[PDB]
Design a protein around this nucleic acid. Structure first.
Ligand SMILES: [Cl-]
Ligand SMILES: [Cl-]
Ligand SMILES: [Cl-]
Ligand SMILES: [Cl-]
Ligand SMILES: [Cl-]
Ligand SMILES: [Cl-]
Ligand SMILES: [Mg+2]
Ligand SMILES: [Mg+2]
Ligand SMILES: [Mg+2]
Ligand SMILES: [Mg+2]
Ligand SMILES: [Mg+2]
Ligand SMILES: [Mg+2]
Ligand SMILES: [Mg+2]
Ligand SMILES: [Mg+2]
Ligand SMILES: [Mg+2]
Ligand SMILES: [Mg+2]
Ligand SMILES: [Mg+2]
Ligand SMILES: [Mg+2]
Ligand SMILES: [Mg+2]
Ligand SMILES: [Mg+2]
Ligand SMILES: [Mg+2]
Ligand SMILES: [Mg+2]
Ligand SMILES: [Mg+2]
Ligand SMILES: [Mg+2]
Ligand SMILES: [Mg+2]
Ligand SMILES: [Mg+2]
Ligand SMILES: [Mg+2]
Ligand SMILES: [Mg+2]
Ligand SMILES: [Mg+2]
Ligand SMILES: [Mg+2]
Ligand SMILES: [Mg+2]
Ligand SMILES: [Mg+2]
Ligand SMILES: [Mg+2]
Ligand SMILES: [Mg+2]
Ligand SMILES: [Mg+2]
Ligand SMILES: [Mg+2]
Ligand SMILES: [Mg+2]
Ligand SMILES: [Mg+2]
Ligand SMILES: [Mg+2]
Ligand SMILES: [Mg+2]
Ligand SMILES: [Mg+2]
Ligand SMILES: [Mg+2]
Ligand SMILES: [Mg+2]
Ligand SMILES: [Mg+2]
Ligand SMILES: [Mg+2]
Ligand SMILES: [Mg+2]
Ligand SMILES: [Mg+2]
Ligand SMILES: [Mg+2]
Ligand SMILES: [Mg+2]
Ligand SMILES: [Mg+2]
Ligand SMILES: [Mg+2]
Ligand SMILES: [Mg+2]
Ligand SMILES: [Mg+2]
Ligand SMILES: [Mg+2]
Ligand SMILES: [Mg+2]
Ligand SMILES: [Mg+2]
Ligand SMILES: [Mg+2]
Ligand SMILES: [Mg+2]
Ligand SMILES: [Mg+2]
Ligand SMILES: [Mg+2]
Ligand SMILES: [Mg+2]
Ligand SMILES: [Mg+2]
Ligand SMILES: [Mg+2]
Ligand SMILES: [Mg+2]
Ligand SMILES: [Mg+2]
Ligand SMILES: [Mg+2]
Ligand SMILES: [Mg+2]
Ligand SMILES: [Mg+2]
Ligand SMILES: [Mg+2]
Ligand SMILES: [Mg+2]
Ligand SMILES: [Mg+2]
Ligand SMILES: [Mg+2]
Ligand SMILES: [Mg+2]
Ligand SMILES: [Mg+2]
Ligand SMILES: [Mg+2]
Ligand SMILES: [Mg+2]
Ligand SMILES: [Mg+2]
Ligand SMILES: [Mg+2]
Ligand SMILES: [Mg+2]
Ligand SMILES: [Mg+2]
Ligand SMILES: [Mg+2]
Ligand SMILES: [Mg+2]
Ligand SMILES: [Mg+2]
Ligand SMILES: [Mg+2]
Lengths: 189, 148
RNA sequence: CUUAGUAACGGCGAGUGAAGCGGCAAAAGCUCAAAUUUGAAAUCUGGUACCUUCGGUGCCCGAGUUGUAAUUUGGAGAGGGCAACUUUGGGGCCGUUCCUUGUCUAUGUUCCUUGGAACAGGACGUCAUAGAGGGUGAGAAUCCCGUGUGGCGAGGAGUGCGGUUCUUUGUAAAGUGCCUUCGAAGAGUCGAGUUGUUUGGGAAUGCAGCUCUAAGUGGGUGGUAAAUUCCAUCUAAAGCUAAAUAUUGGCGAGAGACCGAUAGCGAACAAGUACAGUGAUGGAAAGAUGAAAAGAACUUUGAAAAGAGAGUGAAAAAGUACGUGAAAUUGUUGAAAGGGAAGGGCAUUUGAUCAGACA
RNA sequence: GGAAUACUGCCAGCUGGGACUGAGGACUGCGACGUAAGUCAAGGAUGCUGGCAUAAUGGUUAUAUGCCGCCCGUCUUGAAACACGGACCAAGGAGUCUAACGUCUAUGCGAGUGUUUGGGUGUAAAACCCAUACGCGUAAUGAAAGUGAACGUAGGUUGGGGCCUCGCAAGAGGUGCACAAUCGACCGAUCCUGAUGUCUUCGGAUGGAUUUGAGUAAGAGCAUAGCUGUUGGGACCCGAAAG
RNA sequence: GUCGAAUUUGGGUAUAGGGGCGAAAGACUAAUCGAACCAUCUAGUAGCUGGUUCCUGCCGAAGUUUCCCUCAGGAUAGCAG
RNA sequence: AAAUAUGUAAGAAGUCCUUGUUACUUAAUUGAACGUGGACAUUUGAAUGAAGAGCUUUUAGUGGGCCAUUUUUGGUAAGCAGAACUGGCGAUGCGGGAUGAACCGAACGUAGAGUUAAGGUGCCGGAAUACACGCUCAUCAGACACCACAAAAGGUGUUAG
RNA sequence: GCCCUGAAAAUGGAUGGCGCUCAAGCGUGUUACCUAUACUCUACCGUCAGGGUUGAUAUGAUGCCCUGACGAGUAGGCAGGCGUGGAGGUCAGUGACGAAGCCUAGACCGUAAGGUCGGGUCGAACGGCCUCUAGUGCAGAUCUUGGUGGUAGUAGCAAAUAUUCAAAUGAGAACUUUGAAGACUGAAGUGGGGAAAGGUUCCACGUCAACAGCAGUUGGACGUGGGUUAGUCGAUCCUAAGA
RNA sequence: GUGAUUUCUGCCCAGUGCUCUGAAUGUCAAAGUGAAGAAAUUCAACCAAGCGCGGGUAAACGGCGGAAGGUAGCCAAAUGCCUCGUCAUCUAAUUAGUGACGCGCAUGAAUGGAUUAACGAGAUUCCCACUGUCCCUAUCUACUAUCUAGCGAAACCACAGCCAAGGGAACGGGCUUGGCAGAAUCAGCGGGGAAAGAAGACCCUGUUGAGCUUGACUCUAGUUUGACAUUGUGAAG
RNA sequence: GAAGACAUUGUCAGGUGGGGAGUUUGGCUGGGGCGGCACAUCUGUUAAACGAUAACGCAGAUGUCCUAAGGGGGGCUCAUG
RNA sequence: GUGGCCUAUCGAUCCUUUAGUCCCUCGGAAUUUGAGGCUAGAGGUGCCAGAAAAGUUACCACAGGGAUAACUGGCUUGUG
RNA sequence: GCGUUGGAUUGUUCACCCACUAAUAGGGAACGUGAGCUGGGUUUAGACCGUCGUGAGACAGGUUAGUUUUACCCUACUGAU
């Protein structure tokens, strides 16, 4: 079953695949269901924004570390710096993540600023039961968007010291490669 | 569509284009890649040299993210500056006003030097750079700032 | 969704084949064991009486110290000392939401022709947030039910919340600052050898049998075995938890460029029926008179079945062997040919039969 | 010695009889005969006359006569075969769909391209609108660490359509895209050479080599659709002895 | 042929499919035995046999080369559109 | 030492004159290779022909063959087995050989007229029971390629030498 | 050279047949004549190639027109078309004054796939054109299901010794009933009871379309009813191999 | 395993099996032990059963020539190729039968040899009786066939049904050339229809099976041997 | 009563194991089988004076041998009569 | 002079092993063993473009084959 | 043209004898003739022996037991309308 100049194919269909075929005929139907579920949840739950405020975090890995995204929740130190407790924060619509730690001052300051702005732009109704009617905003994420931090100005002056960047990369690479062998020689002497 | 296929034209011709002698049997020659070294060797040695055997060294649990490094050549370096600002920078080539280009923010890892850039100073920030790319940048009055 | 038919596995043959990141849907957190309540087992099943009965109170046995409550679960937290403010609990009633139902809410059957029947054609009108669908003697928005838009009811569920109302729960409970001493955290288990199985997991991915069997600045992991030196990251051997996901079964609905009685489920019908097999099992065929039986009174021939008339009907060229009624095959009538086949091609005679222009 | 005739050949010599054909549809051409006007057998038929106007001609059909004609389908070098299926009729009855692809073609946009995972919206499985990512492409080459595409109008030579100049033309000169052959240059691999400097073992400048790559050298691709072809699937339809 | 016995036979009961039972024939085990019957895996695979449904127009072959546990089959080159 | 087959050449990418490059080569500007510039146009280098030449992608069927003339191997031989070149059949009807896949003639759109091929002209059967010179008598005459058979040896049958 | 001897095979027999003898035989020469889907000329169809023509006021520049050549074909390739179920658009299409279907050696168009009309039958839906789509075209597969032939009024309806006369009944009697006669089973029976198995076949009345391979007034058939009585007969109780 | 009784069961233990209170320093698993190494690990010693070595065994499998060389018997026998062997007997004539002979292709001793009264729907030869088996056919009876009334199928069927030769897929109902050829039919008949009944069981092919066998390849239930665990207590050599 | 840390049982290890399981048991070929190798190769011929060319055609050969029997140089000349 | 005067005298992938380079990798960071790569050979497939493989069926089976044997017939006639 | 036989042994074709006779010639017709017979032989399955094979089994070696189906059609032929 090999003839002519054709690419080698790797179609994996030697099992009973026809018994496990999933066609998404209900793609339009499920979109209607999801929109109905969001509409009925917003009316049912509260004039609350239907979602919780999220912090801004740095994406891991060298491939994606140049961008910031939304994390799971604010750290215990971040909520403490904002002047509130973790237990009370959860009831006001703030996500708290106890397993995330703070090591970057810039990220810590940005998340503290987010918590400050959130408390100034919300009204917490009293527990007596008066509850004056207020307009419902359906998205706290849209109210508090996440922006990529600035890195540099548009234009500057050329500051050249005469050192080659290519030379710098080669020397730094060579230093790491021979670090172990050089230390051994010094130890022996 | 079915009405444009050759099946419609073969109606009434007995063999349906498959021939009387050879016929259309189930699997003459085996299924899939059968007989790649025995009776399909010629079709494998040509059109597919290098198929049989192993060459390199293995790599257990390779992550592609460790090897992410898109390359950008110098002939496309000025496309990173928006068009509405390119014209003023080209005509005002001077120090103390050199545009700063963040190649990492545009999704590039290493700067290679292929084409020719205008004789205009420019500050290029990148993770990696080739030897020739830096020379052409400095020849125009620019500088490379290494970042991480 | 992607990573990806990729890393890797494989008589490295045929073939097989994940995972981290990234975007999105949905988002929700938590609690036991290990601590002396020790100036007071503070906890609980059951029985019994009463009551405002998915339960409550009094009383009496029992369970339980070989540990039932309160307090603390690693994000912590606990015992003392000091200084301050902040914050409520459990029910009725009426609304709202949800589900199961009921009822009300437009406009021609006006004229002519055909027909058994007007729901057809022609003429003149009306309603329309209603010209979806079905019925009624043939294609009906306006004849009937419904459809569209709104109104007025009835019976339940859940406390989700929108208002009112009865109780002060409580020398109760919770949160937050600083100082000091502490900070208990799961064993034939982790781990190791070996055997089998399994995985993309390769000096061995998970699982299981047998043997060996830990530690507490410890232990697991960091995808090549080992010794030595560091680093990173979590906290096993105990437990609970909505949504986004699945669904050829069950119940209730809405649909189709699907099939149209040898099709479509085996079954449009007294179908898993009739029937077969000791049994497990196997398993059909079969829909249509007409708008309405108006299903043929009566006369006559025949022992009778029936026939010939008559009659019903728009039609018996619709008679319960029933719409339409093809072919194979058959009867009667008419024409033609025929000395061991028949049929065919080209051409014309003979017979029968027929269109075209009379410009 | 002087003729004739036979045989063969030529005539842009003349003339009688018979058969088949009538394509075309204003004019245009080449000629002929004429002093001329005109005419003609000169780039394809007209003129005159008779009978009948209907089954007379003709069509269809049955039959008769002359000649000819073996049963189709199938495998096969070879079938009318003493090779196989077929008594007859009706209805049913066999290259399909899907995943991933090759070539070619049409369409949109183009160094980009792909709205439909999802969100918004709706006259509600339609239509309309949209962010961030992701896929492919825009860089290759090594087992790998790694490095990474201009000596020069992005090179030279030969052949090149088209365009430009001169020329009545023929031709000559200039410029020459795509494409073809060839010699070079550039990037990676391999084999050598080893400068300025040194954590004295690092660093690898410079210049080479009948070596090697699915490369560079003013990008062509991405998406949808169709015929044909490929592989896995029941896989064009029906069929085993078995397990 | 045999006919008083290793006789003939009714009913009850036991042995079930790689198993049973066999004075032994590969015999018998519900007309089924050199491995029963029933359903499913299963539309099991077949280089082998058969079949494969409308018209007209244009072009128009091969039984040869090399390799194959290849010799009734494929790959490859050729011939063809 | 043939015949038949078979390689190359018959120009512009050619010829000639002058002189530039090099790390090759030479005792040596000696040579080699590649070039600058100049001179010679299509009787520009034999014949004939040329439904124009060149080039690319993709894919079907096929991969059992067989026959005739000539060359040829095994075999007593075979309608046997196996090769060489060409033409055919297969895939192909039509006229002829009575009949036949392969022989002879000729290859095919639908018609009319004319002329022929191979083969024929007593009758079947379209066409001369034509013409001319001879031969042959058979109590098993003979009669047309492939082809459907006859030999050695004899006759004072008859004819010619 | 011709002829003869040499020269023997099995159904009857083949210069193709008849027949032919100064041939209608054999060798050779000269003419006339016959006829292929071949050759020559003309018409028409198609294919391919090279060309002409956008000028409005008249319709197809995929149009119209001029010129030349060509035409075999299995396996196979490609192109232009015909027909079928369903879908979007359109023809303000056809129709109870008759849609679809069916029958029709009646007519017309197309090389063909097919299309159109008249007549008869019939009773409720259906078509043209531009596009979309496929479970889209049958003579065969010892094809599937159903229906129907020739064979053919044919094979046959012959084991178990055997029937005959009269009356009654009835539309109808070789076959029912009664009487008479002749026979058989011959007590290990064609007699009289039961076990298993069957399940109303038992009995009476009514009745003959189907069934009893002839017949039928008869029946184990068809229709409607009636009928099985236990302290002592069995089950029930006991135990057997065994479960 | 052999197969009543009678009589007799010879020789061979090299091979293949089976078996042993036999032998010892051959071969040898895991665990354990020792050495080297920083460890993973490597090396060496020790070492169960079995195997090897040794002995026994044929009414174990089997053998009996030119490990032992066919003994007692028996035979052209159901066992002999040559072979219809040679001689005798039986017949007019015998590839048959019987009795002898034996360098026996290839007889033979519980893979039992030889002989045996009685018995046998067993296989053979001859004789007497008997007969239609035959010479050589004839005749009779019943029921069919046959004809009529009623009733009424099936196999099979491309189309069909007269020959001779020719050529042809090398044996025609059809094609070619000749012979011929006249409606509709009844009872018989087995020449032909290469008649019908079944996708040849023979043979070959297929990278299609199954039953059975074996020191084929690869395994396995069971069994056996060793180690560890179950697994404690006391003493001696 | 017997027996005793031995049997037994559990887990690994060696042997035995057609009792049983699964599978295999070439090709060419004047049918197949037996034989042969025409299956990977070499010389001459068949082979028809380029090249190519078949048969289980004809006559033979190969799976080695050599530190020289390899490389260079010098000197010499063999069989036979 | 890049083995034998010339024309024959021989072998892939996977795996193992050796030589060379002492170069690259073990992917949290190092040193040392070990392992894995790069270049060139050897261990072999003689069915020599290279599956790892014993019989029997007279109890037999299936798909096929007149591509192929056991009868006639046809061609041939050595032999008779 | 007309005849070419009767028997012993063998399944036999063939062969070999006895005997009679004018003579006991050779052949064909799908090696004529099985819906004409017969079934002794060969050539299914049972069984025995010899040799061969470890064995299952083999033997163109011997021996014994082993189902012979259908015509009513067409033609031919024989008779009959
Ligand atoms: Cl086509
Ligand atoms: Cl249903
Ligand atoms: Cl059953
Ligand atoms: Cl590299
Ligand atoms: Cl059972
Ligand atoms: Cl048409
Ligand atoms: Mg065709
Ligand atoms: Mg076919
Ligand atoms: Mg191979
Ligand atoms: Mg798997
Ligand atoms: Mg499992
Ligand atoms: Mg690591
Ligand atoms: Mg590993
Ligand atoms: Mg849980
Ligand atoms: Mg149905
Ligand atoms: Mg009617
Ligand atoms: Mg009717
Ligand atoms: Mg009819
Ligand atoms: Mg006429
Ligand atoms: Mg004819
Ligand atoms: Mg054949
Ligand atoms: Mg045929
Ligand atoms: Mg066949
Ligand atoms: Mg048939
Ligand atoms: Mg049909
Ligand atoms: Mg099947
Ligand atoms: Mg199997
Ligand atoms: Mg047997
Ligand atoms: Mg049975
Ligand atoms: Mg199928
Ligand atoms: Mg052609
Ligand atoms: Mg075939
Ligand atoms: Mg073939
Ligand atoms: Mg063919
Ligand atoms: Mg002839
Ligand atoms: Mg004539
Ligand atoms: Mg003559
Ligand atoms: Mg002609
Ligand atoms: Mg053609
Ligand atoms: Mg009508
Ligand atoms: Mg008709
Ligand atoms: Mg109606
Ligand atoms: Mg279909
Ligand atoms: Mg048809
Ligand atoms: Mg049909
Ligand atoms: Mg067909
Ligand atoms: Mg049929
Ligand atoms: Mg009869
Ligand atoms: Mg009978
Ligand atoms: Mg009787
Ligand atoms: Mg009696
Ligand atoms: Mg009696
Ligand atoms: Mg009764
Ligand atoms: Mg009857
Ligand atoms: Mg009756
Ligand atoms: Mg005895
Ligand atoms: Mg003897
Ligand atoms: Mg004797
Ligand atoms: Mg003995
Ligand atoms: Mg004949
Ligand atoms: Mg013949
Ligand atoms: Mg016939
Ligand atoms: Mg004939
Ligand atoms: Mg005739
Ligand atoms: Mg017959
Ligand atoms: Mg067969
Ligand atoms: Mg068969
Ligand atoms: Mg094969
Ligand atoms: Mg098998
Ligand atoms: Mg155990
Ligand atoms: Mg076995
Ligand atoms: Mg073979
Ligand atoms: Mg040559
Ligand atoms: Mg030498
Ligand atoms: Mg080979
Ligand atoms: Mg043959
Ligand atoms: Mg002779
Ligand atoms: Mg015979
Ligand atoms: Mg017979
Ligand atoms: Mg016969
Ligand atoms: Mg017969
Ligand atoms: Mg016999
Ligand atoms: Mg037998
Ligand atoms: Mg019989």
């Amino acid at each position: 079953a090999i003839s002519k100049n054709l690419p080698i194919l790797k179609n994996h269909f030697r099992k009973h695949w026809q018994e496990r075929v999933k066609v998404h005929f209900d793609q339009a139907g499920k979109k209607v269901s999801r929109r109905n579920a969001r509409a009925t949840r917003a009316a049912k739950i509260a004039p609350r924004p239907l979602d919780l405020l999220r912090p801004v975090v740095r994406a891991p890995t060298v491939k994606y570390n140049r961008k910031v995204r939304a994390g799971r929740g604010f750290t215990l130190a971040e909520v403490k710096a904002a002047g509130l407790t973790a237990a009370y924060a959860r009831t006001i619509g703030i996500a708290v993540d106890h397993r995330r730690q703070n090591r970057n001052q810039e990220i810590f300051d940005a998340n503290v600023q987010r918590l400050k702005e959130y408390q100034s732009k919300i009204i917490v109704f009293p527990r007596n039961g008066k509850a004056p009617e207020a307009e419902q905003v359906l998205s706290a994420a849209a109210t508090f968007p996440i922006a990529q931090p600035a890195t540099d100005v548009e234009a500057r002056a050329v500051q050249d010291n005469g050192e080659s960047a290519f030379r710098t990369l080669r020397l730094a690479r060579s230093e790491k490669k021979f670090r172990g062998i050089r230390e051994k020689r010094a130890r022996e002497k | 569509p079915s009405r444009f296929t050759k099946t419609r034209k073969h109606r009434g011709h007995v063999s349906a284009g498959k021939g009387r002698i050879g016929k259309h049997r189930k699997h003459p020659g085996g299924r899939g890649m059968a007989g790649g070294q025995h009776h399909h060797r010629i079709n494998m040695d040509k059109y597919h040299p290098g198929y049989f055997g192993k060459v390199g060294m293995r790599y257990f649990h390779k992550q592609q993210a460790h090897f992410w490094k898109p390359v950008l050549n110098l002939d496309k370096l000025w496309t990173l500056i928006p068009e509405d600002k390119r014209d003023q920078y080209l005509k005002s080539a001077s120090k103390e006003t050199a545009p700063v280009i963040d190649t990492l923010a545009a999704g590039y890892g290493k700067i290679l030097g292929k084409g020719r850039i205008p004789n205009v100073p420019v500050i290029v920030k990148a993770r990696f750079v080739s030897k020739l790319a830096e020379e052409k940048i400095r020849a125009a009055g620019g500088v490379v700032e290494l970042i991480a």
